[PDB]
Amino acid sequence: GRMYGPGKGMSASALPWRRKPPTWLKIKPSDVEEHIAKLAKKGQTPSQIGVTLRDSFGVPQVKSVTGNKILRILKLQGLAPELPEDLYYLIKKAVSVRKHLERNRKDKDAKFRLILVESRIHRLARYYKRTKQLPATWKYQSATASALVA
Amino acid sequence: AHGASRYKKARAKMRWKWKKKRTRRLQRKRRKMRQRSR
Amino acid sequence: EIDLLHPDPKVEASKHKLKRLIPNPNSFFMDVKCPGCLQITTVFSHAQTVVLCGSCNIMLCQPTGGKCKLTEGCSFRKK
Amino acid sequence: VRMNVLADCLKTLVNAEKRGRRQVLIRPSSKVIIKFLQCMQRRGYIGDFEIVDDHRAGKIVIELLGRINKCGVISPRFDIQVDKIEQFCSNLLPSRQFGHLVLTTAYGIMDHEEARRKHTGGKILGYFF
Amino acid sequence: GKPNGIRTARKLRSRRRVQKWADKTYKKAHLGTRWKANPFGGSSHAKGIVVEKLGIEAKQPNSAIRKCVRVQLIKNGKKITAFVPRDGSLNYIDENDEVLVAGFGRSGHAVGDPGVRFKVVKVAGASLLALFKEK
RNA sequence: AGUGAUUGGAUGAUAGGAAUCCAAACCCCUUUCAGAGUAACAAUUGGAGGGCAAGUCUGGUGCCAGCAGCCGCGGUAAUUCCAGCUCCAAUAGCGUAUAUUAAAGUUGUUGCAGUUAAAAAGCUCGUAGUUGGAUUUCUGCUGGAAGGCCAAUUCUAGCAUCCUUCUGGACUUUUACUUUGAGAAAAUUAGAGUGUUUCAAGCAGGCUUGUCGCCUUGAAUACUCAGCAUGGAAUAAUAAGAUUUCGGCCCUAUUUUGGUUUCUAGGACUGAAGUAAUGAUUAAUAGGGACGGUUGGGGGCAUUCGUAUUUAACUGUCAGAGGUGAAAUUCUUAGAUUUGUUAAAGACGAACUACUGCGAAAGCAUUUGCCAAAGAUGUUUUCAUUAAUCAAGAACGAAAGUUAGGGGCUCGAAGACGAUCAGAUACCGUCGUAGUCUUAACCAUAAACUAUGCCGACUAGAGAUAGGAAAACGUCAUGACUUCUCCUGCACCUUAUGAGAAACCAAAGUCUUUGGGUUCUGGGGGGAGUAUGGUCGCAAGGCUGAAACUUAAAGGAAUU
RNA sequence: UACUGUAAUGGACUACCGUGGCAGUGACGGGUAACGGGGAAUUAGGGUUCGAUUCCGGAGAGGGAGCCUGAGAAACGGCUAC
């Protein structure tokens, strides 16, 4: 039932049975890895690469074509982000709400939602420190959060 | 105590809303009288 | 009176994606032919972005809820 | 969310037993369930079952007969000490004659009848009768 | 419901010792107020002197005058009213006469027809049954 | 086969010896002279309405005396009192009082209950705590030792590419778990053997004209979390995520007193060529995040509109208007109430408005714009267990109320009169201050209700409905409608060999055929949400929260 | 860290030096009509209550304190003091 809301939604991508598809496809393992390193250099997140691939170009999935996932390829090349994308987009959301909330102080609903996103940042950071995807002793501060994004 | 039943009024009774108020007036009085003897 | 091992093609087509016996996607890919160019482009059925041509950008399809609309008379062949 | 995989499937089984279905599917399937269903199948409480190999946990579809009155699960998985297998089934099972406790042991998953003669206790898993 | 899991000894053990006190009979045992309360000292019987001869009336429906005695326990000099069992025997008591007091058999509380929890077992050590019988 | 004092003849209680016992008496065990016929050597203790086994008996008493653990007997005919007679229960014992155990599934791990009976925090966040998806040498054939029974069941070696340093232990991440074993005083407890005359006991005895007596005499055995040890393939925690031959480098002990210095022998340190498939499980009808077109009376800040109500203005006309069950207070020729056109003011958003939507709950209905935010749906995107539930602790929390400024139309706790009435500080009527509205703080409770905690699985259909999505040579002109399927919402109807005390219930089902995970609460009714202490509050009061004494019923759902 | 003291180990004690140690898994404090255990009562299993008292430890000899002799006592049917 999600997490924070009461909503209980079943919507998801359901991946196919066969692997290394498709028979119709060709190109190469090598040429796809060049395209990913090109678009990462353009400045584009691991989610946004695989959207750009399956939409315009071929490849349904990169894990089908190459052995590796997209973030595995970026981290091998050394064109990976500093912090992971889900933690990035939660912090950027929290900074956006703090601009709104210190303009409009009487908005109680915005004050409620800022607790929920910043609570999620703290617990999701505690994951990423355990897996060593973040430097040790890395912590969220609402003073220094805005410069940390961009 | 009483909790939820508090006002069940299953059988002829004083009425809870009134009862709570009556006890409040007794209690309020207890305060000033106890502070008077300080 | 029932057959969970061998379900019917008609009924399992109606069901949701994940509730089928083997889950697999009801989306697909398309070799699209825009009117001007002789070139062809491999385009996903549900496209979230406005897809441009192989040279001098026309426009293949605009994104919607589910399946993207294809721009005027232009043919498409499923893979 | 979904702590015990075996605990869901035996409730799914025993419901659709009592309704009186010929066969049922269960989900998400495991290595423990196929071994638990295997030691039902020896004693003759269910028929065949397939296990579809979807690229996921997988679905187990069992043919069954009108034979199980009930099967259940003992969470928490208590420890028991060969002395105390007799004390459990006096409490738990409907009679001394028929029924089975079933309990994981370092010589594989097995019934309490097999656990007596091999002479090793373990952790209790569930039961059926 | 309960916590079933193997490491839930504290929650199970703590809940009993807290909610044991919700019993009425558990509190009468295990509180410290048992020793201050009662005129008896957690004891079966107790001697005392009959300060006065008294009469009390049973609550309706029953009506009558029950003939009890007010006594002071020797150990604590605490006054109590003790009922005198059987017909008469009031004559037997004599003010200032030592009388054994025994529980009415209801663990305090009250008996039948008001507010009396004790019975006089013996008078001058003679005992009530011997005299009523006359044996 | 039982009765019938009708007679009738056949062992110790007792008293004294004998020997035995005893350190000296004494008791027991033996044997002795006396020793029962209402077997006067005389069995009592509690009961006889119910629970509870056993009298609609007969006198006395008359809500008196008294019984009565509880329900109840007694007011002049008592199946309960006080007696007599008869019968019942236990019996050399039986009744009473206090504490305690079972009964108590009325403390519930096994094993209770929480819609209405006692009891789900008003609602979300959340740290410990508790609990956590699937997945990593499985199958087959040939032996070997045992093995119960008229080949099953154990254990074990091989062979499908399976270590080695040696001649049993070193390595296999680490424990828990289970198995066997060690060590752990007896007495007590269970228990083997044995006629203490039986028995509770005790640890003794038993054979036998044999004499260095014998049974190479018995007095077994079990039992005694944490700790030490060990076989093991599951389950569950937990850990992690190089090799093969060559040299520089460099320290350190045996044998042929100390200094000397090589040698070889072996360490830990860093290059050069070679080998091995050179080294990352899936992507949960778990979760987070991205992207797409939408949806909403969700939130904040502006802005704008609509009649009405009250006041004021003029403009008519002229005696009533108001209000009630019926009247009065009140307003009125110094022109009310009604007619019309304006203007100001501050509220409130009718009808459309629904067994509809949105929101964590409280709650949220005029137009337009701006600012962030959310769900569902779609997805051959992405990360890969990041999760569930939550002692402390934290945010929001109608109405009323408080504090300090604005605003004050209407309504209106108090107060005021006028009625009604026996009275009426009320219902009804006419005025009317706080309040109602708003900015800035507080307060923290409501029948804050679905009186039903929150995640998850599975149970049963039909027709509606809100949102999104796909299909149709569909009908009319990107959209409205028709037909059909999918999830996600608020519900509704029907029915159950499902449940319940019943009312009723797709959850209150899958619970004596009792265990998916977890938080909080309750233990007869009062006393009492009181007292005292604590802590929060500017106060009002909130949260926490007893006892003495009191009482046999309170309470639930249906029936007449 | 280094003495001292003891039958020996130790903040046991003394000099200097550092700022630690325990606690929500309940520290610290209060109550016990509390000596602990081997055990006792209680007729499914799980439990609940008791254990001054036959044995094994512990402590005490009206209350506290001090000490001699000796292998051993802070002894009390030994001594000194309040």
DSSP string, A67-83: SS-HHHHHHHHT---SS
Mode of pairing for the β-strands spanning D46-52 and D59-64? antiparallel
- Cα atoms in the 13 Å half-sphere on the side-chain side of D2: 8
Query: What are the distances in angstroms from CA A76 to CA A26, A32, A49, B1?
Result: 24, 14, 16, 69
E52 CA to F32 C1', in Å? 68
Instruction: Please give the domain boundaries of chain A with CATH numbers for all domains.
Output: 26-80 (no CATH), 81-150 (1.10.287.10)
Q: How far is D56 from chain E (nearest CA, A)?
A: 28
Secondary structure E strands in chain D: 23-26, 46-52, 59-64, 71-73, 100-105, 108-111, 123-128
The Cα D125–Cα D5 span in angstroms is 12
Handedness of CA D13, D17, D18, D21 (dihedral sign): positive
Long-range contacts of C3-7 (CB under 8 A, 24+ apart): C4/D23, C4/D24, C4/D25, C4/D61, C5/D23, C5/D50, C5/D61
Q: Is the CB of D23 under 7 A from strand F?
A: no
Task: Read off φ and ψ for residue A25, nearest 5 degrees.
Answer: -65, 150
Q: Strand, helix or coil at E122?
A: strand
Handedness of CA C46, C48, C50, C52 (dihedral sign): negative
Long-range contacts of E1-10 (CB under 8 A, 24+ apart): E4/D75, E4/D76, E5/D75, E5/D76, E6/D76, E6/D77, E6/D78
The Cα C41–Cα E66 span in angstroms is 112
In the chain, the amino acid numbered A16 is: P
CATH of the domain at C72: 2.20.25.100
- The two structure tokens encoding residue C4: 């969970």
The closest nt to E42, taking CA to C1', is: F98
The Cα A65–Cα E74 span in angstroms is 102
| Cross-strand partners of D95 | none
Task: Read off φ and ψ for residue C43, nearest 5 degrees.
Answer: -120, 135
- The two structure tokens encoding residue A125: 């950071």
D27 interface with C at CB cutoff 8 Å = no
The answer to whether E68 and E54 have CB atoms below 8 angstroms apart is yes
Q: Strand, helix or coil at E90?
A: helix
Q: What is the domain extent for residue C63? A: 1-79
Closest-CA residue of chain C to D59: C21
CA angle A103, A105, A110 (to 5 degrees): 95
Helices (H), chain A: 29-42, 46-56, 62-65, 70-77, 85-101, 108-130, 145-149
The answer to whether B37 and B28 have CB atoms below 8 angstroms apart is no
The Cα D6–Cα D60 span in angstroms is 12
The Cα E73–Cα E47 span in angstroms is 6
Resolution (A): 3.3
How is residue D119 annotated by DSSP? T
- Rg of chain B (C-alpha set): 14
Q: Strand, helix or coil at A119?
A: helix
User: Which helix (H) or strand (E) segment is E45 a member of?
Assistant: strand E45-46
Residue E48: other Cβ atoms inside 10 A: 25
Instruction: Please give the domain boundaries of chain D with CATH numbers for all domains.
Output: 1-68 (3.30.1370.30), 69-129 (3.30.1490.10)
Q: Subunits touching E (CB < 8 Å, at least 3 pairs)?
A: D
Q: How far is D3 from chain E (nearest CA, A)?
A: 12
Long-range contacts of A44-52 (CB under 8 A, 24+ apart): A45/A81, A45/A85, A45/A88, A46/A70, A46/A71, A46/A74, A46/A81, A46/A85, A47/A85, A51/C48, A51/C49, A52/C49
D22 interface with C at CB cutoff 8 Å = yes
- Which of E108, E96, E38, E103 shows the shortest CA–CA distance to E72? E96
Q: Is the CB of E33 under 7 A from strand G?
A: no
Quick check: C22 and A10 CB within 8 A? no
The answer to whether A17 and A23 have CB atoms below 8 angstroms apart is no
Mode of pairing for the β-strands spanning E79-83 and E118-123? parallel
Chain A 113..142 CB hits on strand F (< 7 A): 113, 115-117, 119-120, 122-124, 127, 131
Side-by-side strand order, sheet with D23-26: D23-26, D59-64, D46-52
User: Which helix (H) or strand (E) segment is B35 a member of?
Assistant: helix B16-36
Using a threshold of 3 CB pairs under 8 A, tell whether chains C and A touch: yes
Q: Is the CB of C46 under 7 A from strand F?
A: yes
First to last CA, chain A: 33
- The two structure tokens encoding residue D63: 């043919």
Query: What are the distances in angstroms from CA A102 to CA A108, A110, A145, D81, E37?
Result: 12, 10, 15, 65, 64
C-proximal residues of D, 65-104, CB under 8 Å: none
Contacts of A132 (CB under 8 A, 6+ apart): none
Q: Is the CB of E32 under 7 A from strand F?
A: no
Residue with tokens 């558990």: E26
- The two structure tokens encoding residue E108: 């305090």
Q: Strand, helix or coil at D58?
A: coil
The Cα E93–Cα E120 span in angstroms is 10
Positions of chain G reached by protein Cβ under 7 A: 25, 31-33, 44-46
Contacts of D103 (CB under 8 A, 6+ apart): D80, D85, D109, D110, D111, D112, D115, D121, D122, D123, D124, D125
In the chain, the amino acid numbered E132 is: F
The Cα E71–Cα E102 span in angstroms is 12
Work out how many domains chain E is built from and give that number.
Answer: 1
The closest nt to D91, taking CA to C1', is: G45
The Cα A82–Cα A88 span in angstroms is 9
The Cα E125–Cα E47 span in angstroms is 10
Residue with tokens 């909790």: B3
The Cα D82–Cα E12 span in angstroms is 27
The experimental technique used to determine this model is cryo-EM
Contacts of D19 (CB under 8 A, 6+ apart): none
Q: Is the CB of D87 under 7 A from strand G?
A: yes
Q: Strand, helix or coil at D116?
A: helix
Q: What is the domain extent for residue E17? A: 1-135
How is residue B6 annotated by DSSP? G
Q: Is the CB of E135 under 7 A from strand G?
A: no
User: Which helix (H) or strand (E) segment is C78 a member of?
Assistant: strand C75-78
Work out how many domains chain C is built from and give that number.
Answer: 1
The Cα A59–Cα A52 span in angstroms is 10
The Cα A140–Cα A122 span in angstroms is 7
In the chain, the amino acid numbered A100 is: H
